[PDB]
């Protein structure tokens, strides 16, 4: 019987050929929706899958530069790029798609400011993944171009604070990309950081206005920066020390408004039988903190809108495969889908002497069915090859691994006289060739099944003699098949070339060295209770020696009671050293 | 990236012959040609060849 | 207590942290100072037909013997560090010829001579990374070593 197989019958049940003896029940651990694999040349599904589904979008696979990227077009017209390929398993929290957006992409580096925008404070390690926004607001972007180098001073071409145009080779092999004022950082004759910041520059005549703009300030559209100077649009006004002294810089501040909730339509799971629903939550992440001074020659992405896999609590350990479902109404239109597939493997039917019966597995469900957790999925039934009687199935605390079927051909009938055979009982053990009755001798050994008038039923049997001390590999009323080791008999036995000559001539210590005495004496064998045979010899004065024989291999040959120094005691080659 | 379309390796007919190789004290062999494609990860120019 | 010799050399190398570009520029200035001082001493050797004493050499620089000797030391240590922290680069280049006639350890020791020469001829004023100039010298030293030490009948 296979592991986990449970016999369906009791001892003595007379079964017929093909009837179920034992069964293995496969059940769904958590339940869900049934998915039957297609009949790929097999009329027996070798695996059945357990499945929630989300579909309410559109997906198209487009090839760009030889790469198949999937564009998810929402019903609102928005477009997403599928960062995860088909066949990939992702856990909860992993990004599945990225909003295809360019509005929040800067041209160069700069400084970032928040206005009412709020983020989640969970985890510094997620900084590379960005900061999840807890409330929308306004991002203020102050442009700047930063060239970070570690080059010597004498390579410099431009003055500290020079108003420049873009394209000037500010440092040898370094080209500015923004038209603005250049601010230079050097450490001990080593050029470290160069800064080019756009915005209008203006003369600082009144020290009090500069003192107001000592730390830099925001100035709105139309608000007079200083008498005679009104900012036409929101600008960042800061005081900078150019070649001639103080100057006011009006860097153009950009505004990027982020809604409180990402207005990208979520797609809803459609199956209620999943008590742990799985969905795609859209999140907005800002890749940099408030006031984070960013140094980058090229543009950066500030805000990323990401679809993220979410599941109910307790399902955090579940991993969902990602698949494409062709729409039933339009096969061309595919829809992204996440499945928490649970597999159930069906073994092929084997009737050839594995269980020695035909194992046939029948499904208990249908494709697309809804199953509760623990519901039985498949039943594998073992069918008996030959009718008879079922025995050998013991009761209590142990899995039934083997059963016995006594068949029609394992019983023989013999014509014997009842009248004098009364010395026998049903279930006796009859050794063949034994005189059962006067003039009646047992033809074949067996167990006495029944004693009918003039007839005798023998279940064929065969003995094996076992002597004392053997090792038993089996148990009473066990079950053994052909070839199984019954018993290890332990008995006794009793009875040279180049290796011996080489060992003698090289004065090596022979492995099975005979025990040698050290003084004359008597030889007490001393058969102890634990068979601790030790050769105790009594000296000329009465001193014992206590030679331990040890294991059974050094057979004793010493009973002379006249031993002398050097005399051997056991079988084997003596050690000459 | 170099791709070796190794399922299409063709074989050139042996030069000389079995008897010619034997009498010339040479080797009886063929030449193996596999089609390959060098793919530029960006430009995407693929220069297919054997 | 490993028996491998190459692995022991690699461990000994890994006990040294890579330089930074500013560190390279700083060391390059001290190396140039050491080179100029050495050239001067060489001039004294031509004038004296003997090795100048430290006092005569200090006198040739109008420098107190203590100040001069410490400057000399700083320069020595600077060149030492420039070579030492780039041995990893030497190994990285030398691993690309491990089957040409020289053993891997021979390639490393021959490229070390090229690294030493590169550190002797590096110009910070050029405004380039030392890992670009040193590669040429390391490669040249290893190639010459292969040409002159790979065969029994040298060609």
XYZ file of C-alpha atoms in Angstrom:
782
model
C 0.000 0.000 0.000
C 1.196 3.490 -0.881
C 1.958 6.023 1.872
C -1.297 7.456 3.157
C -3.329 4.677 1.552
C -6.227 3.538 3.710
C -7.722 0.061 3.250
C -11.448 0.144 2.554
C -12.163 -3.372 3.848
C -11.735 -5.252 7.104
C -10.040 -8.560 7.799
C -12.039 -11.388 6.279
C -13.855 -9.309 3.669
C -14.280 -11.533 0.636
C -13.544 -9.253 -2.293
C -13.829 -9.730 -6.035
C -11.432 -8.838 -8.827
C -11.249 -5.106 -9.464
C -12.904 -4.070 -6.205
C -11.439 -1.213 -4.194
C -9.156 -2.287 -1.361
C -7.340 0.906 -0.350
C -7.667 4.559 -1.270
C -5.578 7.712 -1.262
C -7.531 10.959 -0.931
C -6.125 14.236 -2.230
C -7.817 17.335 -0.813
C -7.459 21.045 -1.497
C -5.505 22.721 1.292
C -7.152 26.133 0.901
C -9.900 25.832 -1.707
C -10.588 28.114 -4.609
C -11.507 27.607 -8.247
C -10.726 24.411 -10.134
C -8.550 24.659 -13.230
C -8.205 21.551 -15.371
C -5.208 21.245 -17.638
C -5.938 20.705 -21.299
C -5.877 17.163 -22.675
C -2.374 17.385 -24.148
C -2.639 13.945 -25.695
C -3.707 12.512 -22.328
C -7.290 11.788 -21.327
C -6.168 11.918 -17.676
C -5.245 15.297 -16.213
C -1.965 14.767 -14.365
C -2.336 18.093 -12.531
C -5.251 20.257 -11.434
C -4.716 23.838 -10.333
C -6.374 25.932 -7.627
C -7.157 29.564 -8.331
C -9.077 35.422 -7.796
C -9.092 37.139 -11.212
C -8.914 40.771 -12.360
C -9.532 41.760 -15.974
C -11.096 45.208 -16.458
C -8.322 46.729 -18.554
C -6.705 46.201 -21.945
C -3.202 44.903 -22.673
C -1.150 44.899 -25.870
C 2.293 43.371 -26.429
C 4.434 45.770 -28.464
C 7.965 45.095 -29.703
C 10.458 47.944 -29.280
C 14.134 47.386 -30.147
C 13.528 43.644 -30.091
C 12.058 43.792 -26.573
C 8.459 42.707 -26.013
C 7.028 45.260 -23.598
C 3.397 45.142 -22.548
C 1.325 48.326 -22.587
C -1.698 48.291 -20.299
C -4.299 50.681 -21.685
C -6.905 51.485 -19.054
C -10.529 52.180 -19.915
C -9.740 55.821 -19.116
C -7.008 55.902 -21.754
C -3.997 55.825 -19.437
C -0.982 53.711 -20.367
C 1.224 51.517 -18.192
C 4.398 49.568 -18.943
C 4.537 45.980 -17.680
C 7.747 45.689 -15.676
C 7.076 42.002 -14.907
C 7.256 39.354 -17.615
C 4.754 36.515 -18.081
C 5.501 33.435 -16.012
C 7.051 35.389 -13.131
C 5.952 34.900 -9.524
C 5.917 38.015 -7.333
C 4.895 38.377 -3.702
C 2.844 41.145 -2.115
C 4.339 44.612 -2.473
C 6.318 44.042 -5.673
C 5.843 46.523 -8.504
C 4.022 44.993 -11.468
C 3.588 47.972 -13.807
C 4.915 51.520 -14.084
C 2.888 54.513 -15.209
C 4.218 55.765 -18.533
C 4.612 59.394 -17.475
C 6.806 62.306 -18.513
C 5.263 65.302 -16.712
C 7.231 64.661 -13.507
C 10.547 64.207 -15.373
C 13.009 67.053 -14.870
C 15.478 68.280 -17.484
C 18.475 68.535 -15.119
C 19.192 68.237 -11.410
C 18.214 70.729 -8.765
C 16.520 71.212 -5.400
C 13.143 69.877 -4.245
C 10.553 71.531 -1.973
C 7.258 70.220 -0.612
C 3.951 72.077 -0.243
C 1.328 70.107 1.682
C 2.538 66.847 0.134
C 2.804 64.051 2.679
C 4.398 60.615 2.547
C 4.490 57.416 4.558
C 7.290 57.237 7.117
C 7.702 53.437 7.063
C 11.189 52.202 6.258
C 14.434 53.855 5.220
C 15.460 50.798 3.175
C 12.610 51.532 0.745
C 14.299 54.830 -0.191
C 15.598 53.281 -3.416
C 11.991 52.287 -4.083
C 10.828 55.822 -3.289
C 8.482 57.299 -0.723
C 4.812 56.379 -0.765
C 2.742 59.549 -0.737
C 0.112 59.746 1.992
C -1.306 63.057 0.745
C -1.019 64.983 -2.494
C 0.240 68.519 -2.807
C 2.706 70.684 -4.730
C 6.349 70.003 -5.571
C 8.595 73.033 -6.048
C 11.521 72.334 -8.370
C 14.510 74.675 -8.366
C 16.666 73.853 -11.416
C 20.447 73.606 -11.378
C 23.241 71.791 -13.199
C 25.995 70.232 -11.103
C 29.235 68.848 -12.526
C 31.006 66.814 -9.867
C 34.668 66.161 -10.623
C 37.849 65.592 -8.709
C 40.270 67.383 -11.056
C 43.079 69.835 -10.435
C 42.611 73.604 -10.270
C 44.800 74.634 -13.191
C 42.372 72.968 -15.601
C 39.747 75.605 -14.814
C 38.633 78.028 -17.523
C 35.808 80.030 -15.922
C 35.691 82.494 -13.045
C 33.735 82.045 -9.832
C 30.356 83.655 -10.425
C 30.804 84.384 -14.123
C 27.533 84.706 -16.008
C 27.912 82.189 -18.826
C 26.001 80.701 -21.723
C 25.441 76.993 -22.157
C 28.050 75.149 -24.189
C 31.130 76.904 -22.805
C 33.917 74.483 -21.853
C 33.892 75.481 -18.195
C 36.464 72.794 -17.344
C 38.669 71.015 -19.885
C 36.472 68.338 -21.498
C 33.445 69.542 -19.499
C 30.617 71.410 -21.211
C 27.882 73.395 -19.512
C 24.318 72.618 -20.525
C 22.442 75.471 -18.817
C 22.783 79.226 -19.307
C 23.458 80.731 -15.911
C 25.910 81.721 -13.223
C 28.763 79.342 -12.432
C 29.672 78.726 -8.797
C 32.870 76.778 -8.264
C 33.979 74.568 -5.385
C 37.636 73.738 -4.864
C 39.577 72.032 -2.089
C 43.337 72.605 -1.752
C 43.894 73.340 -5.455
C 41.505 70.570 -6.562
C 38.286 71.256 -8.461
C 35.473 69.385 -6.693
C 32.039 70.684 -7.697
C 30.818 73.165 -10.305
C 27.331 74.678 -10.203
C 25.443 76.417 -13.021
C 22.074 77.862 -12.048
C 19.646 79.548 -14.479
C 17.441 82.530 -13.683
C 17.673 86.273 -14.129
C 20.462 88.109 -12.342
C 20.254 91.654 -11.045
C 22.375 94.197 -9.212
C 22.138 94.353 -5.418
C 22.293 98.039 -4.471
C 20.526 98.015 -1.092
C 22.167 95.818 1.573
C 18.828 95.510 3.380
C 17.165 93.762 0.441
C 20.133 91.398 0.232
C 19.816 90.752 3.966
C 16.189 89.810 3.332
C 17.369 87.376 0.633
C 20.328 86.123 2.699
C 18.928 82.580 2.856
C 16.998 82.701 -0.404
C 13.243 83.096 -0.601
C 10.261 82.356 -2.787
C 8.547 85.231 -4.566
C 5.185 84.813 -6.257
C 4.035 86.108 -9.611
C 3.454 89.850 -9.644
C 4.844 90.364 -6.137
C 7.510 93.060 -6.140
C 10.853 91.428 -5.351
C 12.320 94.840 -4.551
C 11.212 98.377 -5.535
C 11.185 98.442 -9.325
C 11.447 94.636 -9.560
C 8.325 92.462 -9.651
C 8.490 88.735 -10.333
C 6.258 87.901 -13.288
C 6.006 84.275 -12.135
C 6.983 82.379 -9.001
C 10.774 82.480 -8.730
C 13.411 81.659 -6.147
C 15.357 84.796 -5.241
C 18.717 84.268 -3.574
C 21.739 86.461 -2.976
C 24.920 85.220 -4.650
C 28.448 86.620 -4.726
C 29.428 87.148 -8.355
C 32.627 88.548 -9.810
C 31.818 92.100 -8.670
C 30.047 91.353 -5.388
C 26.422 90.880 -4.388
C 23.823 89.958 -6.981
C 20.252 88.706 -6.808
C 19.386 85.539 -8.714
C 15.816 84.729 -9.756
C 15.877 81.035 -10.562
C 12.665 79.817 -12.235
C 10.789 77.597 -9.778
C 8.651 74.859 -11.328
C 5.404 73.638 -9.773
C 4.183 70.042 -10.079
C 0.800 69.336 -8.500
C 0.143 65.774 -7.324
C -3.415 64.674 -6.469
C -4.120 63.239 -3.044
C -5.059 59.878 -4.563
C -3.631 58.548 -7.849
C -6.490 58.951 -10.352
C -5.626 55.711 -12.174
C -8.560 53.242 -12.203
C -8.002 50.087 -10.181
C -9.258 46.795 -11.615
C -11.421 44.707 -9.324
C -11.215 41.029 -8.476
C -14.280 39.190 -9.757
C -14.460 36.005 -7.640
C -15.941 35.944 -4.142
C -14.991 32.339 -3.312
C -11.444 33.576 -2.625
C -11.613 34.607 1.029
C -8.184 36.253 0.553
C -8.752 38.696 -2.290
C -5.829 39.833 -4.433
C -5.811 43.229 -6.130
C -3.585 45.837 -7.774
C -3.182 48.991 -5.686
C -1.863 52.075 -7.468
C 0.677 54.071 -5.463
C 2.596 57.306 -5.978
C 6.232 57.482 -4.910
C 8.561 60.473 -4.727
C 12.124 59.287 -5.154
C 13.639 62.080 -3.039
C 12.982 63.598 0.367
C 11.957 67.157 1.198
C 14.749 69.636 0.585
C 16.931 66.908 -0.926
C 19.654 68.767 -2.826
C 20.079 66.705 -5.996
C 23.192 66.928 -8.185
C 22.652 65.494 -11.661
C 23.673 66.670 -15.112
C 20.772 64.827 -16.755
C 17.095 64.814 -15.897
C 15.586 62.692 -13.142
C 12.164 61.149 -12.608
C 10.545 62.629 -9.500
C 7.150 60.925 -9.183
C 6.495 57.311 -10.142
C 3.024 55.770 -10.213
C 3.317 52.026 -9.661
C 0.822 49.186 -9.620
C 1.568 46.987 -6.606
C 0.261 43.538 -5.708
C -1.846 43.582 -2.533
C -3.626 40.749 -0.726
C -5.650 40.357 2.447
C -3.854 39.948 5.759
C -2.626 36.425 6.391
C -1.955 35.917 2.670
C 1.320 37.875 2.748
C 3.301 34.670 2.149
C 1.354 33.871 -1.026
C 3.113 34.300 -4.374
C 1.070 35.038 -7.498
C 1.942 33.998 -11.031
C 1.246 36.587 -13.730
C -0.705 35.488 -16.812
C -2.526 36.884 -19.847
C -6.184 35.973 -20.329
C -7.556 36.300 -23.879
C -10.967 37.926 -23.582
C -13.886 35.608 -24.301
C -15.719 38.207 -26.391
C -12.526 39.271 -28.202
C -9.704 36.683 -28.199
C -7.287 39.301 -29.552
C -7.734 41.544 -26.506
C -5.653 40.175 -23.638
C -6.075 41.118 -19.986
C -3.497 40.905 -17.216
C -4.281 38.421 -14.457
C -2.698 37.339 -11.171
C -3.251 33.810 -9.862
C -2.290 32.155 -6.584
C -2.096 28.795 -8.348
C -1.961 25.831 -6.020
C -0.950 22.561 -7.708
C -2.327 19.065 -7.246
C -0.323 16.345 -9.006
C -2.080 13.221 -10.304
C 0.032 10.087 -10.676
C -0.564 7.878 -13.691
C -2.377 4.596 -13.121
C -0.008 1.658 -12.552
C -1.456 -1.865 -12.350
C 1.807 -3.816 -12.753
C 3.044 -5.249 -9.457
C 3.855 -1.892 -7.840
C 0.950 -2.277 -5.456
C 0.286 -5.505 -7.399
C -3.194 -4.059 -7.962
C -4.611 -1.513 -10.360
C -4.423 2.008 -8.920
C -7.041 4.220 -10.585
C -7.404 7.892 -9.679
C -10.773 9.593 -10.148
C -11.323 13.316 -9.777
C -13.958 14.473 -7.301
C -14.545 17.872 -8.951
C -14.978 19.554 -12.335
C -13.097 22.347 -14.082
C -14.075 25.774 -12.823
C -15.719 24.388 -9.696
C -15.512 26.199 -6.372
C -14.037 24.140 -3.545
C -13.777 24.848 0.150
C -10.445 24.215 1.888
C -9.996 20.564 2.782
C -12.439 19.346 0.124
C -11.417 16.032 -1.432
C -9.900 16.529 -4.879
C -8.995 13.042 -6.121
C -9.500 9.459 -4.956
C -6.982 6.796 -5.982
C -8.515 3.339 -5.529
C -6.486 0.120 -5.539
C -8.282 -2.754 -7.258
C -7.480 -6.341 -6.283
C -6.204 -8.665 -9.000
C -7.545 -11.916 -7.514
C -10.572 -12.612 -5.362
C -10.162 -14.217 -1.964
C -9.996 -13.127 1.670
C -8.310 -10.016 3.053
C -6.073 -10.517 6.089
C -2.891 -9.179 7.640
C -4.385 -5.714 8.246
C -3.653 -5.018 11.912
C -5.458 -2.385 13.971
C -4.042 0.526 15.909
C -1.797 3.562 15.539
C 0.115 2.353 12.451
C -0.413 2.988 8.748
C -1.560 -0.066 6.784
C 1.364 -0.647 4.402
C 0.664 -4.216 3.227
C -2.392 -6.448 3.064
C -2.887 -10.114 2.196
C -5.338 -11.806 -0.151
C -5.727 -15.555 0.270
C -7.064 -16.796 -3.026
C -8.876 -19.849 -4.352
C -5.641 -21.554 -5.410
C -4.030 -21.138 -1.962
C -6.363 -23.792 -0.511
C -6.360 -27.504 -1.330
C -8.737 -30.296 -0.351
C -7.605 -33.790 0.608
C -9.614 -36.941 1.309
C -8.865 -38.012 4.890
C -10.924 -39.919 7.433
C -12.468 -37.681 10.096
C -13.097 -40.495 12.568
C -9.493 -41.012 13.664
C -8.087 -37.637 12.560
C -9.763 -36.035 15.604
C -6.281 -35.144 16.918
C -6.179 -32.176 14.505
C -7.806 -28.766 14.799
C -8.617 -26.017 12.279
C -5.525 -23.839 12.157
C -3.008 -26.544 13.025
C 0.463 -26.495 11.466
C 1.020 -29.693 9.472
C 4.547 -30.541 8.345
C 4.379 -32.472 5.085
C 5.330 -36.131 5.193
C 3.947 -36.525 8.716
C 1.705 -39.501 9.475
C -1.591 -37.743 10.143
C -3.565 -40.983 10.613
C -2.603 -44.649 10.707
C -1.617 -45.293 7.108
C -2.240 -41.622 6.233
C 0.761 -39.356 5.623
C 0.695 -35.619 4.947
C 1.335 -34.955 1.232
C 1.960 -31.197 1.497
C 2.520 -28.816 4.371
C 0.020 -26.106 5.177
C -2.377 -24.616 7.681
C -5.498 -26.575 8.635
C -8.412 -24.503 7.357
C -11.427 -26.796 7.767
C -12.202 -30.431 8.555
C -15.179 -31.606 6.501
C -16.549 -35.159 6.684
C -13.992 -37.090 4.668
C -12.177 -33.931 3.537
C -9.515 -31.518 4.771
C -8.754 -27.933 3.734
C -5.079 -26.920 3.751
C -3.872 -23.393 3.079
C -0.469 -23.883 1.471
C 2.411 -23.073 3.796
C 6.115 -23.679 4.159
C 8.313 -23.653 7.281
C 11.844 -22.440 7.915
C 13.839 -23.815 10.815
C 15.374 -21.173 13.079
C 17.948 -21.957 15.740
C 18.782 -20.145 18.953
C 20.638 -16.872 18.576
C 19.435 -15.965 15.095
C 18.462 -12.398 14.215
C 14.838 -11.890 13.237
C 14.148 -9.424 10.433
C 10.379 -9.906 10.666
C 7.512 -10.052 13.156
C 4.805 -12.538 14.038
C 1.824 -12.237 11.678
C 3.842 -9.924 9.445
C 3.641 -9.807 5.671
C 6.541 -10.682 3.372
C 6.801 -11.156 -0.373
C 9.102 -13.288 -2.481
C 12.773 -12.734 -1.775
C 12.414 -10.861 1.519
C 15.112 -11.689 4.071
C 13.481 -13.815 6.762
C 16.228 -14.345 9.312
C 19.978 -13.994 9.834
C 21.350 -17.249 11.228
C 24.442 -17.005 13.426
C 26.405 -20.230 13.802
C 29.948 -21.446 14.321
C 32.689 -22.857 12.126
C 36.236 -24.118 12.496
C 39.101 -25.450 10.405
C 49.475 -19.355 3.374
C 51.519 -17.706 0.643
C 53.494 -14.607 -0.253
C 51.700 -12.207 2.149
C 52.667 -14.417 5.088
C 56.309 -14.571 4.034
C 56.453 -10.818 3.466
C 54.816 -10.182 6.841
C 57.239 -12.533 8.594
C 60.326 -11.116 6.875
C 59.283 -7.493 7.457
C 58.528 -8.105 11.148
C 55.071 -6.612 10.853
C 52.494 -6.912 13.599
C 49.930 -9.503 12.461
C 46.403 -8.124 12.649
C 44.928 -11.167 14.417
C 47.736 -11.401 16.936
C 47.532 -14.378 19.262
C 47.582 -13.611 22.980
C 50.968 -14.506 24.469
C 51.708 -15.232 28.107
C 54.423 -13.529 30.139
C 55.170 -16.043 32.905
C 54.468 -19.708 33.710
C 51.276 -20.526 35.537
C 47.936 -22.292 35.429
C 45.158 -21.530 32.958
C 41.826 -20.622 34.517
C 39.396 -20.161 31.640
C 37.028 -18.182 33.909
C 33.747 -18.369 32.018
C 32.140 -15.280 33.527
C 28.451 -14.368 33.507
C 29.057 -11.931 30.641
C 31.337 -14.570 29.066
C 34.308 -12.426 30.113
C 36.833 -15.134 29.308
C 40.147 -14.029 30.797
C 43.197 -16.266 31.152
C 44.247 -15.749 34.766
C 47.555 -17.502 35.486
C 48.949 -18.132 38.963
C 52.658 -17.417 39.246
C 55.190 -19.452 41.207
C 54.351 -17.152 44.129
C 50.645 -16.720 43.397
C 50.479 -13.660 41.157
C 47.638 -13.409 38.658
C 48.005 -12.041 35.138
C 44.436 -11.431 33.890
C 44.830 -11.906 30.159
C 41.550 -10.838 28.506
C 40.568 -12.953 25.521
C 38.268 -10.227 24.271
C 36.112 -10.856 21.215
C 35.039 -14.237 19.885
C 37.452 -14.360 16.955
C 40.529 -15.146 19.116
C 39.483 -18.732 19.709
C 41.102 -20.249 22.775
C 43.304 -23.321 22.443
C 45.024 -23.059 25.815
C 44.041 -25.533 28.514
C 47.461 -26.996 29.234
C 47.702 -25.716 32.822
C 51.478 -25.893 32.259
C 52.061 -22.611 30.414
C 55.522 -21.072 30.200
C 56.712 -17.610 29.257
C 55.994 -16.899 25.618
C 53.441 -19.689 25.231
C 50.534 -18.820 22.979
C 46.944 -19.028 24.174
C 44.700 -18.289 21.185
C 44.564 -19.044 17.475
C 46.599 -16.933 15.063
C 50.090 -15.656 14.254
C 52.166 -14.507 17.196
C 53.648 -11.020 17.235
C 57.458 -11.361 17.306
C 58.122 -7.827 18.540
C 25.590 39.650 -28.019
C 26.635 36.712 -30.176
C 24.006 34.065 -30.860
C 25.067 30.709 -32.306
C 22.090 29.187 -34.109
C 23.599 25.782 -33.530
C 20.589 23.828 -34.724
C 21.481 24.760 -38.326
C 25.165 23.805 -38.452
C 25.798 22.637 -41.994
C 28.661 20.398 -43.055
C 30.934 20.865 -46.062
C 31.667 17.860 -48.218
C 35.022 16.238 -47.434
C 37.917 17.339 -49.556
C 40.203 14.804 -51.230
C 38.615 11.359 -50.554
C 38.880 8.417 -48.192
C 41.364 6.717 -50.498
C 43.036 10.017 -51.355
C 43.386 10.844 -47.663
C 44.863 7.400 -47.050
C 47.369 7.573 -49.904
C 48.303 11.224 -49.320
C 48.819 10.661 -45.572
C 46.205 13.245 -44.680
C 43.030 13.442 -42.614
C 39.477 12.538 -43.596
C 37.310 15.355 -42.323
C 34.684 17.959 -43.106
C 34.260 21.612 -42.233
C 31.614 22.840 -39.811
C 29.738 26.086 -40.391
C 27.207 27.409 -37.890
C 25.035 30.468 -38.574
C 25.499 33.266 -36.066
C 23.941 36.650 -35.372
C 25.726 39.535 -33.661
C 23.081 41.718 -31.995
C 23.861 45.241 -30.827
C 21.962 45.755 -27.568
C 21.068 49.334 -28.557
C 21.528 50.197 -32.237
C 19.965 46.817 -32.968
C 22.048 46.191 -36.073
C 22.248 42.424 -36.559
C 24.995 41.209 -38.891
C 23.914 37.663 -39.678
C 26.621 35.394 -41.073
C 28.012 31.861 -41.088
C 47.506 28.775 7.420
C 47.011 28.126 3.706
C 49.737 26.662 1.511
C 48.757 28.487 -1.701
C 51.130 31.315 -2.608
C 48.940 33.264 -5.025
C 46.050 33.372 -2.568
C 48.413 34.660 0.109
C 49.545 37.414 -2.243
C 45.924 38.289 -3.028
C 45.136 38.537 0.682
C 48.196 40.730 1.244
C 46.933 42.934 -1.585
C 43.420 43.141 -0.156
C 44.772 44.617 3.071
C 45.248 47.902 1.177
C 42.420 50.297 0.342
C 42.105 51.812 -3.116
C 43.097 55.451 -3.532
C 40.708 58.217 -4.518
C 41.363 60.739 -7.270
C 42.200 63.547 -4.839
C 44.534 61.141 -3.081
C 46.154 60.408 -6.432
C 46.656 64.125 -7.113
C 48.128 64.678 -3.660
C 50.498 61.759 -3.992
C 51.458 62.863 -7.500
C 52.668 66.218 -6.219
C 54.877 64.564 -3.594
C 56.168 62.108 -6.200
C 57.141 64.989 -8.482
C 58.922 66.690 -5.589
C 60.824 63.471 -4.879
C 61.769 63.125 -8.546
C 63.139 66.666 -8.736
C 65.096 66.169 -5.512
C 66.520 62.910 -6.898
C 67.557 64.678 -10.103
C 69.406 67.263 -8.036
C 71.200 64.582 -6.026
C 72.158 62.886 -9.318
C 73.720 66.226 -10.271
C 75.709 66.153 -7.041
C 76.800 62.608 -7.901
C 78.114 63.853 -11.241
C 79.880 66.736 -9.490
C 81.350 64.652 -6.646
C 81.967 61.361 -8.511
C 80.547 59.873 -5.312
C 77.239 59.572 -3.532
C 76.532 62.924 -1.835
C 76.027 62.786 1.893
C 72.629 63.770 3.268
C 74.302 66.896 4.643
C 75.776 67.792 1.253
C 72.462 66.991 -0.412
C 70.590 69.056 2.192
C 73.151 71.784 1.585
C 72.451 71.537 -2.139
C 68.781 72.297 -1.388
C 69.555 75.081 1.142
C 67.423 73.012 3.504
C 67.916 72.021 7.150
C 68.981 68.384 7.281
C 65.867 67.513 9.284
C 63.413 69.262 6.970
C 65.116 67.822 3.877
C 65.160 64.280 5.255
C 61.500 64.450 6.227
C 60.555 65.760 2.771
C 62.517 62.876 1.251
C 60.673 60.428 3.485
C 57.245 61.826 2.608
C 58.078 61.440 -1.076
C 59.276 57.863 -0.633
C 56.097 56.942 1.237
C 53.943 58.679 -1.379
C 55.427 56.669 -4.242
C 55.178 53.530 -2.123
C 51.465 54.096 -1.519
C 50.788 54.946 -5.166
C 52.232 51.595 -6.279
C 50.824 49.653 -3.330
C 47.194 50.704 -3.711
C 47.247 49.909 -7.462
C 48.643 46.385 -7.312
C 44.990 45.294 -7.636
C 44.950 46.948 -11.056
C 48.167 45.134 -11.885
C 46.552 41.789 -11.052
C 43.430 42.712 -13.019
C 45.448 43.380 -16.143
C 47.883 40.497 -15.661
C 45.119 37.901 -15.435
C 44.467 38.344 -19.179
C 47.665 36.556 -20.287
C 47.840 33.552 -17.953
C 48.486 31.144 -20.870
C 51.319 32.647 -22.909
C 54.567 31.347 -21.406
C 54.739 33.118 -18.059
C 53.074 31.934 -14.884
C 50.459 34.133 -13.257
C 52.838 35.153 -10.486
C 55.450 36.124 -13.078
C 52.930 38.265 -14.928
C 52.062 40.026 -11.674
C 55.678 40.753 -10.749
C 56.543 41.953 -14.244
C 53.513 44.231 -14.363
C 54.528 45.647 -10.997
C 57.604 47.128 -12.693
C 55.340 48.794 -15.231
C 53.145 50.158 -12.464
C 56.237 51.565 -10.745
C 57.326 53.290 -13.947
C 53.803 54.619 -14.512
C 53.737 56.041 -10.985
C 57.091 57.623 -11.783
C 55.776 59.289 -14.972
C 52.209 60.223 -14.007
C 51.264 63.874 -14.505
C 48.456 65.191 -12.317
C 48.370 68.396 -14.373
C 47.228 66.346 -17.355
C 43.894 65.984 -15.599
C 43.427 62.267 -16.074
C 42.801 59.273 -13.861
C 45.882 57.275 -12.872
C 44.090 54.070 -13.863
C 44.232 55.219 -17.495
C 47.926 56.056 -17.660
C 49.066 53.104 -15.548
C 47.323 50.569 -17.788
C 49.625 51.352 -20.710
C 52.777 50.840 -18.664
C 51.495 47.669 -16.993
C 50.484 46.191 -20.342
C 53.795 47.148 -21.939
C 55.839 45.645 -19.119
C 53.902 42.387 -19.248
C 54.117 42.167 -23.048
C 57.862 42.822 -23.010
C 58.326 40.269 -20.242
C 56.481 37.656 -22.291
C 58.600 38.516 -25.332
C 61.812 38.168 -23.318
C 61.089 35.378 -20.819
C 58.531 32.946 -22.255
C 60.770 30.764 -24.419
C 63.931 28.800 -23.745
C 65.366 29.922 -27.099
C 64.380 33.542 -26.719
C 63.254 35.369 -29.867
